[PDB]
Amino acid sequence: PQITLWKRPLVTIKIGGQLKEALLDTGADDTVLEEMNLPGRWKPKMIGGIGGFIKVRQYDQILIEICGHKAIGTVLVGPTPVNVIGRNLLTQIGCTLNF
Amino acid sequence: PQITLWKRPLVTIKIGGQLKEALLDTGADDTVLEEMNLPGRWKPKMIGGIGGFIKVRQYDQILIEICGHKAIGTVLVGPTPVNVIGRNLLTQIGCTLNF
Ligand SMILES: COc1ccc(S(=O)(=O)N(CC(C)C)C[C@@H](O)[C@H](Cc2ccccc2)NC(=O)O[C@H]2CO[C@H]3OCC[C@H]32)cc1
Numbered sequence: 001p002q003i004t005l006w007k008r009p010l011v012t013i014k015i016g017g018q019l020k021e022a023l024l025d026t027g028a029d030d031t032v033l034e035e036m037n038l039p040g041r042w043k044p045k046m047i048g049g050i051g052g053f054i055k056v057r058q059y060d061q062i063l064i065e066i067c068g069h070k071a072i073g074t075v076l077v078g079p080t081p082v083n084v085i086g087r088n089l090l091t092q093i094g095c096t097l098n099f
Numbered sequence: 100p101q102i103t104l105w106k107r108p109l110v111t112i113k114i115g116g117q118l119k120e121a122l123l124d125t126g127a128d129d130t131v132l133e134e135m136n137l138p139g140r141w142k143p144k145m146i147g148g149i150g151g152f153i154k155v156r157q158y159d160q161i162l163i164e165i166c167g168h169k170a171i172g173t174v175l176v177g178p179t180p181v182n183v184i185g186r187n188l189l190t191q192i193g194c195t196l197n198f
Pocket residue numbers: 023025026027028029030031032047048049050051082084086124126127128129130131146147148149180181183185
C-alpha cells in the first residue's frame with residue numbers, strides 16, 4: 001500500500017505466532033519490540049535512542065509478518081516505549097519513502 | 100524522488116539560514132533538531148523514545164526546506180544526536196511510505 005503520514009503508520013504484525021501493533025519507523029536502524037516471550041536463543045545487547053541506552057535481548061533470524069509481507073531478521077526485545085519496525089525489516093518488505 | 104532504506108534516509112534541509120543533514124523519520128511525531136540558537140519565542144517540552152526523555156525547546160511556525168520542498172511548522176530543538184524530520188513536516192512535502 002501507499003501510506004500517508006497524517007496519522008502514525010501503525011500496522012499489524014505477527015511474531016511468535018502472536019498478533020501485535022507496530023510502528024513503521026524509517027528513523028530506526030533496528031526493530032525493537034516491547035517485552036515479550038519469544039522462542040529460541042538470544043544474546044544481550046545495548047541500543048541507543050533519543051533518550052539514552054537500554055538493554056535488549058537480540059533474537060536473530062526471527063520470522064515476522066508485517067502488514068501481510070513476510071520478513072526474517074533480527075528483532076530486539078526490551079523496554080522500548082513503542083513496538084518499532086526498523087529499516088532492517090522495512091527493506092525486506094520492499095518499503096520506500098516517496099515524495 | 101524515491102528513497103530506499105538500505106541506508107539511513109538522510110536529506111539536506113535548510114533551517115534558520117543553515118544547511119544540515121536530517122533523517123526522514125516516519126516514526127517521529129514531531130521534528131527534532133540538534134542544538135542550534137534559533138531566534139524567537141519558545142516553550143519547553145519533553146519528548147520520549149528509546150532510552151527515556153529529553154528536554155527540548157519548541158519553536159512554532161518555523162520555515163524549513165526539505166530536499167527542495169518548502170515547509171513551515173513546529174520544530175523542537177535540543178540535545179538530540181540526530182536531526183529528525185517528523186510527520187508534522189513530512190506530510191507537508193507529500194511524503195508517503197510505499198510497499
Ligand atoms: C514527539 O515527537 C517525537 C519525535 C522523535 C522521537 S524518537 O527519536 O525517540 N523516535 C520515536 C520512536 C522510538 C517511537 C523516532 C525514531 O525514529 C528514532 C529516531 C532516532 C533517535 C536517536 C538516534 C537515531 C535515530 N529512532 C530510534 O530510536 O531507533 C533505535 C532503534 O534503532 C536504532 O537506530 C537508530 C537508533 C536506534 C520521539 C518523539
